[PDB]
């Protein structure tokens, strides 16, 4: 019997174990209305073209329990069989009490019965279409259906085609910070639970007393976290798969107010509340639709924690997003799942690609082709060792920035110098450093000008003190000594291009001469290198 998938966390590192070894989700995620047998023919070709190893796809409460007590797993049966035929794995997305803050995917007998399953009430007494996490009947009903889905996987998915489940989808509330219903006010205007007071090491009191100006938001996050933890515990008691929640992000630099962003989700200001309230939820995953490097880089920093494995549970499917695979994996990320990878005639532009076509898919296939050939080796190095990864750090030049034209000719040479500097990244690899640059020839040392559009990146894993696994894309990687060498010289000892067969390295060729004189130059094609550096005495 195949071992259960498990999220391992050790010495601040994390692995998603699948079939007893670390695994990387090189994902594809459907649009929101592809969770039906007839839609699957519009999902698989994209997944094949992408080279994805894992499909993220919804399972909706409305579809599995359309009449109370009358369960229907017909979709899950077809999805399992067709995934198995393609030798891919699944992440099921439980669309239930919350889907983007709302109950649209709850059955009609739930979402149309507000007295049994109550909505968030604003301070002014107006109601929002967002179920209250203090609704005890709604918690019992969600938990009961979730348990029936997990019983379906316990009985029908013994080899764990499904490796992980997302509990709810982008929880929270737009339009208000919390529930201000009478039922919610009786809990708010009362003692904070001792367990939270103890975990945050705070002094006992009421929500307002203990949290002050943050009481309303922290209250909603705590109550939603508890609700999602209870659904999670109930499901894991049936089959103990990894389970996670996906966050409708607030802007980490300039968030605005809770309710403008989805209040109560796992936003960066309430990760402490979520971790204290929901010990059974494996990780809190960001849904990334910010296109600019600085903001995305900040999200990856905030969500990668000693207590939080990094899973990019959604990302935009426009071209600029593909290169974020590199920093995601460099952070020890367990996966990456671009959203909207199907041909069901929908695009979420402006969040994603304006057009969905083979070119849209190819931007992701090209970076997946760097990782797929080493996926198990990379996953093990990421968990047990030292890895790094970078993306091209300037976004594509805007029409408003092309401003460049109105610049004097000295402002221009200075711009070119400034861009070359910004397109040059340093990595400290112990005894050796790497310098990664973007958008230059494969010969000579003309400064980097960037790729058009921005697209490059690099992955490095340490194999030994002087040996690295390297693959990169539309970039140059150069090695150098990390520390002054006291009389010694240094060189590349050997660069081998090759592959892993049955976990053994197979060399195909040695890079040397022009291929190593000017750093290690990558285009759009996949090359996996083993780089051995040496210092040597000359005296
Ligand atoms: C600044 S910004 O990046 O432009 N802010 C955008 C963040 C708001 C986006 C909400 C995303 N929701 C996700 C969840 C998926 O299920 C599906 O709905 C999907 C959307 O296509
Ligand atoms: Na990892
Ligand atoms: Na060093
Ligand atoms: Na150094
Ligand atoms: Na090769």
Residue numbers in the entry: 36 to 437, 439 to 575
Please quote the authors directly.
GM1-Gangliosidosis and Morquio B disease are two manifestations of mutations on the GLB1 gene that encodes the vital lysosomal β-galactosidase. This enzyme is responsible for removal of a β-galactosyl residue from the non-reducing end of its substrate, converting gangliosides GM1 and GA1 into GM2 and GA2, respectively. Based on X-ray crystallographic studies of compounds 1, 14, 16, 17 as well as 22 and 31 in complex with Cellvibrio japonicus β-galactosidase (CjGH35), a tractable bacterial model which shows around 27% sequence identity with the human enzyme, notably conserved active centers, intensities of inhibition and chaperoning properties, may be partially rationalized. For the inhibitors studied here, the ligand sugar moieties have clear density in all the active sites and overlay with ring C atoms 2 to 5 in similar positions.
Ligand 31 is identical to 17 apart from lacking a hydroxyl group at C-2, the importance of which is reflected in a much poorer Ki value (200-fold worse for human lysosomal β-galactosidase). The active site residues are similarly oriented in all of the structures, with slight differences for 31. There are two other differences in the ligand interactions of 31 (not only from those seen for 17, but also from the other complexes studied here). Firstly, there is a hydrogen bond from the C-3 hydroxyl to ND2 Asn204, in addition to the three hydrogen bonds to Asn67, Lys134 and a water molecule (which is hydrogen bonded to OD1 Asn204 and OE1 Gln64). Secondly, there is a shift in the position of Gln64, with the NE2 atom forming a hydrogen bond to O Ala348, instead of the OE1 interacting with a water which is hydrogen bonded between O Thr65 and ND2 Asn67 (as seen in the other structures). These probably play a far lesser contribution to the weaker Ki values than the absence of three potential hydrogen bonds from a C-2-OH group. The importance of this interaction is clearly seen in comparing the Ki value of the GH35 bovine β-galactosidase with 17 and 31. These inhibitors differ only in the presence of the hydroxyl group at that position, and indeed 31 binds some 20 fold less tightly, corresponding to an approximate 2 kcal/mol difference. An even bigger 200 fold affinity difference is seen for the human lysosomal β-galactosidase (GH35), implying crucial interactions of this particular hydroxyl group with GH35 enzymes. The corresponding deoxy derivative 31 exhibited distinctly reduced chaperoning activity and was only trailed by deoxyfluoro analog 37. For the cyclopentanoid chaperones, on the other hand, OH-2 appears to be a vital feature for their activity as inhibitors and pharmacological chaperones, since its absence and the concomitantly increased basicity of the adjacent amine apparently cannot compensate for the reduced number of interactions with amino acid residues resulting from the removal of this particularly crucial functional group.
